[PDB]
């Protein structure tokens, strides 16, 4: 089953397809309608004609729909220097270090992996909205990843794509920075569906694909696959609720492994585009914060 | 006025005392009742008998009332190193260092001041209930801090304390680790009341206290004045705001000048006790997680 | 205890006044505060000082607090012909017959009594408030009635004071309009307090008084006592709820005595004064309805 | 646009079938929905395909979906007396009447028609469902009427089939006793769907069939036309709303033509029909009330 979710005059309406191209529209909260599918693979709803799931990835409104985020999730966390390449995030010197090894190559180690909170609901966007640069950052990059979307005990009810966008330079210049860097309005976007779980065979068997569109030029072209994930999904899981409870809905980005280079910093009318075997492709449009 | 909040058969209701000592039960929102005295001092409601305010911060219950949390914010930030001291925030070696100084030391005299998530509602506790020491945290201290409460704009809509409560060991490990040193279940308490903005002269003119009990036993006591805050407020809104949209009734907590030695860390039964002139006093129990 | 409310800025507040004089605001719904008196005598609130409810009854307004409605009763049912000389209402000639026999004639003696539908919520009105007399109507009378709020069982949870409006003539013309006489905006008054049960000793043992006052005159003065009652209240529960659910906070009205005269018409701009022992008085302005 | 309505695992879902036998799930309330296609024609919704309407018709239920009510009426209103032959209703001596002619006689004829209160939304049932008879009834008759959905100025926004239970022998020993015989759980059944006003040419040139069914037996069947109807509906409208607001989704049923005989008398596990051009078949399973 895949979720996603319109906006149509003011209010929200949930979607599934099945298998067999067949679109079902929800009875249930789609939180609610995760929770019974992870149980006993039920669906609440009826089968509609006139939805057209393949124009809305392209189009993005057909009539008085809009596809958006597929749920409201009641918080984002994210995780850290889950790949092999992920030590080098930021090599040059100027970076924190703890006696000569710096604060990214000790974490990718170390028993602990990086959790961080990433974004509240109302700081999220999905398909076809504006992603976010902030006003005072001169190098913002997107981080294409595989994101999780869990219950309250930590199960994986399902599967999605984010971009966890962030201000490099800020963090750069002061890990302490790091939640000014990461937590502001536009800094995450997910979707177009969330996937249940048997939906995917192996998490760790997909391929990841980064794309930066700049007025009609592939401004970078970056792919990675799940199989370079050094750090598992289930141990990030098991820190992340550890003293802490999580509400039902709740996602966690995975990390990421493609980073763009020093020059290749986001600006206003840029196109995100971010590709998962067997979800989908999210795009964004972007757009640069005023003073 | 200064307000609180009891829960009483699994409900709600807010007071406010005025100046004389006479006491009004809230007809709104104790949120929108902030907003409102911030605009004309309008206070919406009924004088009320029989509720003994004095006996409530000692006893925490009488009768069927129990004083808690005196509002629920939707978002609570903190700020780091804002005090000459603070610079000194682990001195020892081993702390991250970019170019020979460290992380906190430059953060100090740097144009952008620290800023971090600190709780959701849920994660937060009040007067006379149990503030929390992680499972795996071999070293949590209390944070004694001035707090402002702001609507969606940054302005200041009363004061309050917060005891930003910080597992030690865990930040020092690895700077990467301060979103799980600082945001779990408990990690956070304030009250026993807010304060309107006029109830407090000047801000910068203040005696914040500090003193922990173990079984009768005075273990630390430590005080410092608001004079020694060398980062203004209004600064630390400014940035926290900065393409940042924050819900009417969230929370910024300064930061802390009181640090405890690293033999002083909190354990199970403990009594935390935080006092800032023309507020009152917070009294929470320490209640150690099990593994 | 006595039960008020009043409409406060476009929101409800209910009061109730302990035979010593102390007014209490209540916690919970009025419907659901008599419930619970009606069981263990517990009522939900605080004391409060500076409602001045013997202002209320006199003014109807005091600052920005006007006496209402008690309560909204989910459904309003009226008893008929339940006093001896209630035989007579409407003697002369034109009246229904069977078999020489009026049709109130009739009812006085049968096993079983008169119950009609009265009134929905919204087309009562309270204490202060104007009562109305149909446009087509050159004959409309007010009638003082004792009036029982009841659960869904049929116990009765207090007493009250109703104004029974009735469009006289229309009745006359023919016992097939009566729904039209009685069923209309302001067809109904009542308050202008509700009185728990223990309140009333004898049910049957109150004075009932009617005053109709045109520019200061006192244009009628009419007084009857219960004890003149011959249809019991309970039997005409009884009726009401066979085969019939009612919900919780019902009013049933148990019947006038006080019949004025064909030429006693209420008009434009008059004062209806009612009152019963141990309740109060209820006193509704006048107001004709326009073609 | 033919309006139903579902009760699905104790939620409701409506549904609306156009001309070309194509199922629209609805966006709105039902009521919002009739308002809507009177004014533009505009219906909020998607296409959906495995509602099986027809069979819904005659089974009642299909899989987890049952019909039910279309909507839920605010209130209920009768009117009396409205054709021809209704003059005779209970021709038998022991009728009330006014100076030798009967009181049925005399409304029949007058300018004001007879109106009365119906039902609650509560006291109401739908296609497939129990109507009622009284405990203390030995003679209760189904009356078929056509029944007009209004908004609250009085504008007709649809039609539906009406069953008008009345406790005739009540009726008949004193017209006090009307509303008993009238008002109480299942003495009013209505549907199966509501026709929107376009889907009906002239109201008054429909066939109206009346049969009860005993044990597979056709214990009575009757059949009168709408050009019988003496008394316009407009004028029944007009006379309902005088001095008398009513809320939007109101229904108004305008009167019987077939009246079974004395002995047709309601009983146990009958099974009453009723249809009307262009509406349907209501079908409702008789249940007589235990004392
Ligand atoms: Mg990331
Ligand atoms: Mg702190
Ligand atoms: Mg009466
Ligand atoms: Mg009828």
Redesign the pocket.
């Known amino acids: 089953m895949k979720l996603f979710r319109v906006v149509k005059r003011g209010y929200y309406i949930s979607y599934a397809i099945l298998d067999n191209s067949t679109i079902i529209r929800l009875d249930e909260d789609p939180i609610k309608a995760l929770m019974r599918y992870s149980e006993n693979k039920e669906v609440l709803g009826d089968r509609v004609t006139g939805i057209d799931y393949q124009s809305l990835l392209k189009s993005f409104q057909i009539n008085d729909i809009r596809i958006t985020k597929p749920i409201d999730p009641p918080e984002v966390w994210?995780s850290?220097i889950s790949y092999e390449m992920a030590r080098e995030r930021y090599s040059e010197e100027n970076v924190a270090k703890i006696l000569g090894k710096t604060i990214y190559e000790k974490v990718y180690d170390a028993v602990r992996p990086e959790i961080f909170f990433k974004a509240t609901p109302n700081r999220c966007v999905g398909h076809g909205e504006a992603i976010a640069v902030r006003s005072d950052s001169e190098w913002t990059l997107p981080?294409p990843?595989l994101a999780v979307v869990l219950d309250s005990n930590g199960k994986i009810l399902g599967y999605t794509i984010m971009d966890?966008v962030?201000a490099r330079d800020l963090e750069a210049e002061n890990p302490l920075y790091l939640p000014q860097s990461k937590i502001y309005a536009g800094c995450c976007a997910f979707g177009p569906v969330i996937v249940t779980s048997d939906e995917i065979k192996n998490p760790y068997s997909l391929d990841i694909t980064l794309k930066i569109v700049r007025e009609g030029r592939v401004f970078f072209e970056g792919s990675v696959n799940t199989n370079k994930m050094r750090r598992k999904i289930e141990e990030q899981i098991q820190y992340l609720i550890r003293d802490n409870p999580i509400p039902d809905g709740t996602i966690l980005?995975t990390?990421?492994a493609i980073v763009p280079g020093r020059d290749k910093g986001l600006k206003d009318e840029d196109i995100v585009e971010i590709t998962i075997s067997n979800i989908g492709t999210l795009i964004t449009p972007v757009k640069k914060r005023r003073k």
């Open positions: 994210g850290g981080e990843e966890d962030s980005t990390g990421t």
